[PDB]
């Protein structure tokens, strides 16, 4: 699962979930050897408004969300951006060090 | 996803990397209802959708 943890300005600690990643096989020998994965990530972005951005993705509509605002609850559809992707031991190493 | 990402979340006293990932993940899914039957709204042109 794609998770992060954080604290608000108000101080409350919180766990967020963005989506999921399904790891393929990973007999990674060379530092460039590839792991195939599938990322399934939530979004409210309509992909058709900028379809060139999403060449590699297959976007699903998976739900409806009642979103609270100032003084009006809004109804927006919930998309799921699915795609096959890949990474390597070296690329993962440098991702772990992004701090 | 960068700017286009969307989060399901829970209030949770846990620290910056605490708890079992899939247990936390299910906790986040249970906050959201109104899942639909899934439908393709934008195809991956080169792939079996």
């Amino acid at each position: 699962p794609i998770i992060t943890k954080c604290r608000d300005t108000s101080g409350q600690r919180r766990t967020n979930l963005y989506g999921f990643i399904i790891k393929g096989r990973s007999h990674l020998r060379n530092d460039t050897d590839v792991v195939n994965f599938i990322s399934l990530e939530f979004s409210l972005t309509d992909p058709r408004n900028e379809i060139h951005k999403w060449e590699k993705y297959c976007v699903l509509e998976i739900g409806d969300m009642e979103i609270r605002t100032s003084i009006s609850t809004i109804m927006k559809p919930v998309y799921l951006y699915v795609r096959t992707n890949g990474t390597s031991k070296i690329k993962m190493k440098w991702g772990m060090e992004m701090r | 996803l960068l700017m286009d990402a969307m989060k399901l979340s829970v209030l949770n006293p846990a620290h910056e990397g605490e708890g079992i990932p899939m247990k936390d993940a299910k906790a986040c899914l249970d906050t959201f209802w109104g899942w639909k039957k899934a439908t393709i709204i934008k195809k991956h042109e080169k792939g079996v959708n």
């Binding site: 969300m65 009642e66 | 990402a5």
Partner: peptide, 10 residues
């Protein structure tokens, strides 16, 4: 604005 597309109040 009205809401957050990234961390929406639901």
């Amino acid at each position: 604005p009205s809401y957050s597309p990234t961390s929406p109040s639901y």
